[PDB]
């Protein structure tokens, strides 16, 4: 089998909220390596979380997660995991578990991601005066808000498509 | 001090086959203390995982062709492609892990001089169409779900506050 790394446990939170996140990993001897977290912001910058040693014993961690982020490993399930208290705007991203060849190199196989939202706080004190009808009312004018700019992001794509096509039709 | 890892430049054009080269450069030096210089190269296609290319500085990742070659020292490294192909367009990222906290550079974007036309498509081979063809799907699914996620952001607060009243 090749090497697959699946996270999962992503999700929306509330700040201050907690989350705990997987990775499951199958095709290789899970015990034999240390894990690591990686996460992109939506900024598209990448940022080191954690790294947890082949056995569990050592754990590392930058001082913008250390105190809230615990990573730990059950070497029996083939399972990583990421323990995240306390979120902050600055942790939405989406985050990657990844393998390491210890001594070597530190990320060399990578899973699909999983994405973290954290939410704004500030929407939860804005609507607690408002009525029910009108928070219903906005609650239904925004089914037809999303799915019209999820439609125009395929017609961007349909747009980038077509001289691609008639290239490959041209030859 | 935490070290921070520079990339020149942010976006680079090219042509299929041209030389590209890429810096980065540490603020300090980047010497673990076994004595190795843990200075790795990864390569990231949009809306997909990042995937490694050169670590050590210069060593070859399994499966990655000739024509990468990652060099420096002290604090300035490079990463070049002789030859541009068409699998080796997206974002490139340093990366240093000599110093706790291990620190990403800031991306540098090799993409094609596209221009206002189309016509630069004409001498791709259609096997190389293909490839640009199948990389869009990667990035217009990643922008939906950036929608999907925004409106969780912009409901959940509602549907809070509904039963909560």
């Given at each position: 089998?090749?090497?697959?790394?699946?996270?999962?446990?992503?999700?929306?939170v509330?700040?201050?909220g907690s989350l705990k996140?997987?990775?499951?990993?199958?095709?290789?001897?899970?015990?034999?390596?240390?894990?690591?977290?990686?996460?992109?912001?939506?900024?598209?910058?990448?940022?080191?979380?954690?790294?947890?040693?082949?056995?569990?014993?050592?754990?590392?961690?930058?001082?913008?997660?250390?105190?809230?982020?615990?990573?730990?490993?059950?070497?029996?399930?083939?399972?990583?995991?990421?323990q995240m208290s306390?979120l902050?705007?600055?942790?939405?991203?989406?985050?990657?578990?990844?393998?390491?060849?210890?001594?070597?190199?530190?990320?060399?196989?990578?899973?699909?991601?999983?994405?973290?939202?954290?939410?704004?706080?500030?929407?939860?004190?804005?609507?607690?005066?408002?009525?029910?009808?009108?928070?219903?009312?906005?609650?239904?004018?925004?089914?037809?808000?999303?799915?019209?700019?999820?439609?125009?992001?395929?017609?961007?794509?349909?747009?980038?498509?077509?001289?691609?096509?008639?290239?490959?039709?041209?030859? | 001090?935490?070290?921070?890892?520079?990339?020149?430049?942010?976006?680079?054009?090219?042509?299929?086959?041209?030389?590209?080269?890429?810096?980065?450069?540490?603020?300090?030096?980047?010497?673990?203390?076994?004595?190795?210089?843990?200075?790795?190269?990864?390569?990231?296609?949009?809306?997909?995982?990042?995937?490694?290319?050169?670590?050590?500085?210069?060593?070859?990742?399994?499966?990655?062709?000739?024509?990468?070659?990652?060099?420096?020292?002290?604090?300035?490294?490079?990463?070049?492609?002789?030859?541009?192909?068409?699998?080796?367009?997206?974002?490139?990222?340093?990366?240093?892990?000599?110093?706790?906290?291990?620190?990403?550079?800031?991306?540098?974007?090799?993409?094609?001089?596209?221009?206002?036309?189309?016509?630069?498509?004409?001498?791709?081979?259609?096997?190389?169409?293909?490839?640009?063809?199948?990389?869009?799907?990667?990035?217009?699914?990643?922008?939906?779900?950036?929608?999907?996620?925004?409106?969780?952001?912009?409901?959940?607060?509602?549907?809070?506050?509904?039963?909560?009243?």
């Amino acid at each position: 089998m090749e090497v697959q790394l699946v996270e999962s446990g992503g999700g929306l939170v509330k700040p201050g909220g907690s989350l705990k996140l997987s990775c499951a990993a199958s095709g290789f001897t899970f015990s034999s390596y240390a894990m690591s977290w990686v996460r992109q912001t939506p900024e598209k910058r990448l940022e080191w979380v954690a790294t947890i040693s082949s056995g569990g014993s050592y754990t590392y961690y930058p001082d913008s997660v250390k105190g809230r982020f615990t990573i730990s490993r059950d070497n029996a399930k083939n399972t990583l995991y990421l323990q995240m208290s306390s979120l902050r705007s600055e942790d939405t991203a989406m985050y990657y578990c990844a393998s390491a060849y210890d001594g070597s190199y530190y990320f060399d196989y990578w899973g699909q991601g999983t994405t973290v939202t954290v939410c704004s706080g500030s929407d939860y004190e804005f609507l607690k005066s408002w009525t029910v009808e009108d928070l219903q009312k906005r609650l239904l004018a925004l089914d037809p808000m999303m799915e019209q700019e999820i439609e125009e992001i395929r017609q961007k794509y349909q747009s980038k498509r077509q001289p691609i096509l008639d290239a490959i039709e041209a030859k | 001090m935490d070290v921070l890892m520079t990339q020149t430049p942010l976006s680079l054009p090219v042509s299929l086959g041209d030389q590209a080269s890429i810096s980065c450069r540490s603020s300090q030096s980047i010497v673990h203390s076994n004595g190795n210089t843990y200075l790795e190269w990864y390569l990231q296609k949009p809306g997909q995982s990042p995937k490694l290319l050169i670590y050590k500085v210069s060593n070859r990742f399994s499966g990655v062709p000739d024509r990468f070659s990652g060099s420096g020292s002290g604090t300035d490294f490079t990463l070049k492609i002789s030859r541009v192909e068409a699998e080796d367009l997206g974002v490139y990222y340093c990366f240093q892990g000599s110093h706790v906290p291990w620190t990403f550079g800031g991306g540098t974007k090799l993409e094609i001089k596209r221009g206002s036309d189309y016509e630069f498509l004409k001498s791709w081979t259609v096997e190389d169409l293909q490839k640009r063809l199948l990389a869009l799907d990667p990035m217009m699914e990643q922008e939906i779900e950036e929608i999907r996620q925004k409106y969780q952001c912009k409901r959940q607060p509602i549907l809070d506050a509904i039963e909560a009243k």
